[PDB]
From a paper:
The TRiC/CCT complex assists in the folding of approximately 10% of cytosolic proteins through an ATP-driven conformational cycle, playing a crucial role in maintaining protein homeostasis. TRiC is an ATP-dependent macromolecular machine that facilitates substrate binding and folding through ATP-driven conformational transitions. It consists of two identical stacked rings, each containing eight paralogous subunits (sharing ~25–40% sequence identity in the same organism) arranged in a specific order. An individual TRiC subunit comprises three domains: an equatorial domain (E domain) that contains the ATP-binding site and forms intra- and inter-ring contacts, an apical domain (A domain) that comprises the interaction sites with target proteins, and an intermediate domain (I domain) that connects the other two domains.
Numbering used by the authors:
A (entry chain Q): 26 to 251, 270 to 549
B (entry chain g): 16 to 186, 196 to 225, 350 to 371, 436 to 592
C (entry chain z): 14 to 245, 263 to 539
Write the structure that this text describes.
């Protein structure tokens, strides 16, 4: 009522995410009750919008939150790995093996995998500020994320990270990384070649009264803010608003930021004194506005303190995507980080997949800076084949009942190379011997042989099966794999620990 | 239809094989059947089980003719060989209906498996001389341990071994043993027998006619042997032929294959551990369906563990380690489920027992894989 | 996945012992069977009950077929074998359902099976059957009739069976069940008025009412050729008078002085009543339409011989009888002849209301005569009154390091067999409304007190007062060969359900 019932739901979702991962991977369409259509290959976003009536399989749904908080990438790899571990364990259940040795078998092999990740690591090379290093991290995401164009998207991200880079060369001990430092804007129409990068951050709003530049003012000033008796309130407000707006114009403040409701009488004087105003800033825009500009949102409607004010070297309100838009565009010299990357595309759904792909690229820098390093792992399924030889060796080194769990734990690794063959329509049985041909019988006496040095890249080479991953720069994140086996083991043992569903007053 | 039709065929042989799992060994269990007519048949022999049951699955009907071929050779213990044909079908579930492995590729792997199996059969080969009557006496008594005629076999099995050697001799040694004529006399004691060398109807010793309610006695001197059996009961004559007339297969198998293999389901233990080692040297696409055959070989000895009330997972851990390391002469005790080796177990079976078992299993398994689907309603 | 059908098959099978639970002991009630034609039979015999009763569960139907072999083994109280294996299965559900394998626990009962005969070997008691002491003979009849009929019919049929078992006997222990077969079944008087006849009885008689109703010495002669002519008219009747002349000459030749003797005629065909008037003066009895089976038994009892022609008559072929008397009941005249030349075969005259009450006595004396016959055949007799239920259970209960023979789960099978033997004695007092727990205090605990006295005592269970008794004083005894194959056969019959993994529905379509 549970195991067989859950596996029926597992094989469903496992086959779904099987075609998501890989450069040949596929997307899916999800329609909610409101009619919203979302196309993405991410498993965390997929299961989030879907409504599942089976509480048993929901363990893998909530398990994605552990991966998104720790890393945010490799979500498709976790669902495929965790889903396969429960599929290969079905044979041990029919054999009569209790879950005691099954849970202990996965936990024993999990510690053995972490020991191999430190021995099998290569490509230290330890360079933060190189533009080529930013390309080596963002290129491999074409497997799990959108593979459409890796040439243009890799260049815009590398120029944006280097623009917001704190520098502080040698040892600067830089804390407080900015995840929000990268932002993209969806613009309907145009191709990807029309996209570019701006030193400042941009946003979608339209000017009304002035549209003038005003950035030529050579260190200008910007402010930030948080029957005759019937005319007593009317004339009373006209005298106060006039005096408050005049003192601002006397100080030479070209643009102000108003985060509250702006009346009709307020906008009347702004056109005469030539003062720009922002209309209804959101919550996430208000936090980015005060931190980058460095101005205090004084709630007083009067003249703000001229000592602390915002400054923008160069800003233009003219057209960008064909419509006039006022933006925050700036220059790194006199003002801080958090630039943006402007995207151009015809399909709005394709811009969403690029947004999720760039957001995962921010975690690549997080994985390098927060621990000692992100290191490297063989990409395109070349890491799993390295573990198959190690886990198989551990089965003979530890005789006992764990050999049945160790055997099924190594067989579960066959889904990763099958992913490349299934999504490409090629026979997995033809590519399988080409994968074993790298290590042959044993490893040659040379260091970093074709098993470690080369990998599986299938375009025209499907007959050969092996390709160098060094020139292709195809690698897997080490912090992701460490957290992948942790979430997969915790989620697999959780389903096996389920006994009976309990309903309380319903 | 297509792959879905083959799934019903795998479960058809799997459901039949699961019934005969407990039909092997001296601890073999029994099965009760209920027909729509209301008759009940309770027996431990799978021969009459497959004949009386009319199965709706067309794939299970092929196993009925296979049982007739296996029973034509020996018939005792060879009924459970069908399990091996059923385990291979269930072994293809991760491959055939999942990896989409082509059946001929599996059949080609079974061709290399059947060839490598005969090499393992020659590895456990233990020749023994047939001139010793005491060595051949304990050989025919192997199949007697499943019956209460054990202590009765002292005056029984000695008559069968002496009659076959007269009609066997040599030519190779191929000859016809069917010239023997066995006569059964109801009533009396089982210990009473008749020793007669000749033809029952030059310088003849004597001629006499005894007194028997059936017929008289006549002696014919030649220049051929008959057996007169006196049963200890009325209907016991049916079980006497099973322990003597049907026991002639042991005398036929020792002449064709003088070698001895571990008896009581202990032979395939050394075969499964050796087949896994031969798979690592293949290094090909077929290695996975070839190595998976060893997983189907270890399911047969689990029938003894299911009969001995043990744990097949934990017990076979030490058992498979003995055959793959210490020696291939080790075996499994079926009675108590113990590690006692076949050396002190005192029972050995000819190699042809497992030869014809694996040969007929692979030939029956490939034919089931060559069937794409099954259609009905042709109205022939 | 496993079996799980074993607990379902026995659950439907447990209903058989619940029906037969009240069939045990002399305090039990008889079961009634009725057909669609109106015939009603009341008996406790398991062969008739299990045959007519159709159980919806086929599992209990095949087990009921094994009770046919209990006829020669026991024949009286075969329900004990069925109720013994019923609780024997329930004791396995407390084990097998907990993960114990059926084959492992089965070997535990197979060991205790053979070991039960070794304990029974020293448990049996041998008696001297050559003395023909009526003290032990009347007790064996009480071990049966009390478990069949009431106390009123007990004192009636007891000397009837006692005189029947003593009629067939020899110093060489020669006994034949086919020697005594014919049993007169009549509807008249009451079942309590039945008597024991010392000779054979025929169901036919003469058509002449004036024939002598009492004869001192009668000479029985079997006549083959019919006395009355059939077909080829005045010369046909003269041939009959010529045959009657030889009968008159033979009557006066044997005894010509005192008319204290008589002659009996047995004819296969009818006899003219006009010719029977001559026999009235000579006191000669005649018969007609005699069956072949009835005439064959007269040569071995009365001593006569079949004669074809009446022209040759000799006293050598004439038998004799010590007492002959006839009685006319309704329109069917019967002849009672006893004290024949070879009076080793007798008959039991049974009268009653209808065949409903007659079926109780017929089945009681049939197996009752065979049960007491096994006492003379097998001198070893087993103490009854439930003495061996506790004894055989106590020997296997105490094992420790002295005598065990098993290990692990096989050791628990011996303990389960000791508890399986106690269901019968608890059932005997349950049918009478008594608490079996308090009975064991005065019975089971009494054996432990006599054990410390260095004396061998076997104490039974009295169902009348619900207290202990002495099987020797009460007179309840069972033969050795009866309970030998019953206890051993019960293990084999119960094994058929223990050896069944699951019940599969399939067969010829």
């Amino acid at each position: 009522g549970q195991i067989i019932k859950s596996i029926a739901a597992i094989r469903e979702l496992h086959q779904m995410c099987l075609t998501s991962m890989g450069p040949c991977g596929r997307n899916k369409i999800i329609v909610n009750h409101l009619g919203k259509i979302i196309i993405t290959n991410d498993a965390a976003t997929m299961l989030r919008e879907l409504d599942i009536v089976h509480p048993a399989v929901k363990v893998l749904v909530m398990a994605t939150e552990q991966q998104k908080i720790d890393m945010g990438d490799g979500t498709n790899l976790v669902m495929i790995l965790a889903g396969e571990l429960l599929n290969v364990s079905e044979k041990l259940i029919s054999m009569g093996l209790s879950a005691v040795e099954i849970i202990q078998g996965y936990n024993m092999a999990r510690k053995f995998t972490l020991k191999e990740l430190d021995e099998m690591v290569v490509g230290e090379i330890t360079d933060k500020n190189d533009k080529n290093e930013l390309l080596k991290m963002i290129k491999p995401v074409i497997s799990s994320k959108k593979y459409g164009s890796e040439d243009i998207l890799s260049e815009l991200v590398s120029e944006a990270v280097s623009h917001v880079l704190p520098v502080a060369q040698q040892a600067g001990e830089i804390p407080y990384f900015n995840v929000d430092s990268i932002r993209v804007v969806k613009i309907m129409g145009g191709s990807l070649s029309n996209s570019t990068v701006i030193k400042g951050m941009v946003f979608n709003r339209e000017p009304e009264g002035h549209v003038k530049s005003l950035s030529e003012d050579k260190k200008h000033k910007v402010a930030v803010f948080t029957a005759q008796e019937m005319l007593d309130f009317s004339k009373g407000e006209e005298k106060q608003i006039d005096a408050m707006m005049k003192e601002i114009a006397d100080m030479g403040v070209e643009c102000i930021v108003a985060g509250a409701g702006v009346g009709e009488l307020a906008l009347h004087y702004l056109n005469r004194y030539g003062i720009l105003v922002l209309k209804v800033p959101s919550k996430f825009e208000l936090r980015r506005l005060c931190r980058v500009c460095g101005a205090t949102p004084l709630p007083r409607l009067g003249a703000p303190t001229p000592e602390e004010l915002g400054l923008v070297e160069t800003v233009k309100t003219m057209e960008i995507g064909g419509d006039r838009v006022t933006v925050f565009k700036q220059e790194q010299g006199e003002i801080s980080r958090t630039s943006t990357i402007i995207l151009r595309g015809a399909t709005q759904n394709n811009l969403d997949d690029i947004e999720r792909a760039i957001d995962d690229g921010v975690a690549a820098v997080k994985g390098l800076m927060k621990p000692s390093g992100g290191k490297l792992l063989p990409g395109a399924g070349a890491t799993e084949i390295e573990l198959i030889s190690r886990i198989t060796k551990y089965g003979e080194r530890t005789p006992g009942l764990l050999q049945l769990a160790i055997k099924q734990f190594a067989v579960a690794f066959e889904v990763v190379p099958r992913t490349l063959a299934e999504t490409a329509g090629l026979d997995v049985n033809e590519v399988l011997p080409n994968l074993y041909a790298a290590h042959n019988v044993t490893e040659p006496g040379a260091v970093k042989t074709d098993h470690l040095y080369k990998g599986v890249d299938i375009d025209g080479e499907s007959d050969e099966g092996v390709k160098d991953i060094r020139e292709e720069n195809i690698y897997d994140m080490l912090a992701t794999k460490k957290f992948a086996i942790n979430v997969a083991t915790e989620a697999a043992t959780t389903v096996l620990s389920i006994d009976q569903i309990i309903m309380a007053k319903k | 239809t297509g792959r879905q039709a083959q799934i019903s065929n795998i479960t058809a042989a799997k459901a039949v094989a699961d019934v005969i799992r407990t039909c092997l060994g001296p601890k073999a269990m029994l099965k009760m059947l209920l027909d729509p007519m209301g008759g009940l048949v309770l027996t431990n022999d799978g021969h009459a089980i497959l004949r009386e049951i009319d199965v709706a699955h067309p794939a299970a009907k092929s196993m009925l003719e296979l049982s007739r071929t296996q029973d034509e050779e020996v018939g005792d213990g060879t009924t459970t060989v069908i399990i091996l044909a059923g385990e291979i079908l269930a072994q293809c579930a991760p491959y055939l209906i999942e990896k989409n492995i082509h059946p001929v590729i599996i059949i080609q792997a079974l061709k290399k498996a059947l060839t490598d199996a005969l090499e393992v059969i020659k590895q456990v080969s233990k020749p023994v001389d047939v001139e010793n009557d005491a060595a051949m006496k304990k050989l025919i008594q192997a199949s007697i341990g499943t019956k209460y005629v054990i202590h009765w076999s002292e005056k029984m099995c000695e008559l069968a071994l002496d009659a076959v050697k007269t009609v066997r001799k040599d030519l190779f040694e191929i000859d016809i043993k069917r010239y023997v004529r066995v006569e059964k006399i109801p009533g009396g004691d089982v210990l009473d027998s008749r020793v007669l060398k000749g033809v029952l109807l030059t310088n003849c010793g004597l001629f006499k006619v005894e007194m028997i309610g059936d017929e008289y006695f006549s002696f014919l001197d030649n220049c051929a042997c008959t057996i007169m059996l006196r049963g200890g009961s009325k209907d016991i004559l049916n079980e006497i032929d099973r322990n003597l007339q049907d026991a002639m297969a042991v005398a036929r198998n020792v002449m064709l294959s003088p070698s001895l293999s571990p008896g009581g389901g202990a032979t395939e233990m050394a075969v499964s551990v050796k087949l896994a080692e031969k798979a690592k040297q293949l290094e090909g696409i077929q290695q996975w369906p070839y190595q998976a055959v060893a997983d189907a070989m270890e399911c047969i000895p689990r029938t003894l563990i299911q009969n001995a009330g043990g744990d097949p997972i934990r017990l076979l851990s030490q058992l498979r380690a003995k055959h793959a390391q210490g020696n291939f002469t080790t075996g499994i005790d079926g009675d108590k489920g113990k590690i006692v080796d076949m050396v002190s177990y005192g029972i050995w079976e000819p190699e042809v027992i497992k030869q014809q078992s694996v040969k007929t299993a692979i030939e029956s398994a490939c034919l089931l894989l060559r069937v794409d689907d099954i259609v009905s309603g042709v109205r022939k | 996945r496993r079996d799980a059908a074993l607990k379902v098959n026995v659950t439907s099978a447990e209903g058989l012992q619940s029906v037969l639970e009240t069939n045990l002991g002399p305090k039990g009630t008889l079961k009634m069977l009725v057909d669609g034609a109106g015939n009603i039979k009341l008996t406790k015999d398991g062969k008739v009950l299990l045959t007519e009763m159709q159980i919806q569960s086929p599992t209990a139907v095949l087990i009921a077929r094994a009770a046919a072999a209990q006829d020669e083994i026991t024949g009286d109280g075969t329900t004990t074998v069925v109720c013994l294996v019923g609780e024997l299965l329930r004791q396995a559900h407390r084990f097998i359902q907990e993960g114990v394998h059926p084959r492992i626990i089965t070997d535990g009962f197979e060991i205790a099976r053979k070991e039960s005969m070794k304990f029974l070997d020293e448990f049996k008691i041998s008696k001297t059957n050559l003395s023909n002491d009526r003290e032990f003979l009347l007790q064996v009849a009480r071990s049966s009739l009390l478990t069949k009929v009431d106390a009123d019919l007990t004192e009636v049929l007891t000397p009837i069976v006692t005189d029947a078992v003593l009629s067939v006997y020899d110093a060489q222990a020669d006994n034949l069940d086919l020697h005594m077969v014919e049993i007169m079944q009549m509807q008249h008087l009451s079942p309590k008025d039945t008597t024991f006849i010392k000779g054979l009885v025929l169901d036919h008689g003469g058509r002449h009412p004036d024939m002598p109703t009492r004869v001192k010495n009668a000479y029985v002669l079997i006549l083959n050729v019919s006395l009355e002519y059939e077909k080829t008219a005045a010369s046909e009747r003269k041939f009959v008078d010529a045959k009657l002349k030889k009968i008159i000459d033979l009557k006066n030749e044997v005894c010509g002085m005192d008319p204290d003797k008589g002659f009996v005629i047995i004819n296969q065909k009818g006899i003219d009543p006009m010719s029977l008037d001559v026999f009235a003066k000579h006191n000669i009895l005649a018969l007609r339409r005699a069956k072949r089976r009835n005439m064959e038994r007269l040569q071995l009892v009365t001593g006569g011989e079949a004669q074809n022609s009446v022209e040759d008559l000799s006293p050598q072929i004439l038998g004799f009888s010590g007492l002959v008397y006839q009685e006319t009941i309704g329109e069917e005249k019967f002849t009672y002849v006893t004290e024949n030349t070879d009076p080793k075969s007798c008959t039991i005259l049974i009268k009653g209301s209808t065949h409903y009450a007659l079926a109780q006595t017929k089945d009681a004396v049939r197996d009752g005569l065979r049960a007491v016959a096994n006492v003379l055949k097998d001198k070893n007799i087993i103490p009854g009154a439930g003495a061996f239920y506790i004894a055989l259970s106590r020997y296997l209960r105490s094992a420790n390091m002295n005598k065990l023979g098993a290990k692990g789960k096989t050791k628990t099978g011996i303990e389960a067999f000791a508890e399986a033997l106690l269901v019968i004695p608890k059932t005997l007092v349950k049918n009478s409304g008594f608490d079996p727990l308090d009975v064991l205090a005065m019975v089971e605990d009494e054996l432990d007190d006599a054990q410390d006295s260095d004396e061998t005592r076997y104490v039974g269970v009295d169902l009348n007062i619900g207290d202990s008794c002495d099987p020797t004083i009460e007179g309840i005894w069972d033969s050795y060969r009866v309970l030998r194959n019953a206890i051993t056969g019960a293990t084999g019959i119960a094994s058929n359900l223990l050896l069944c993994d699951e019940l599969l529905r399939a067969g010829r379509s």
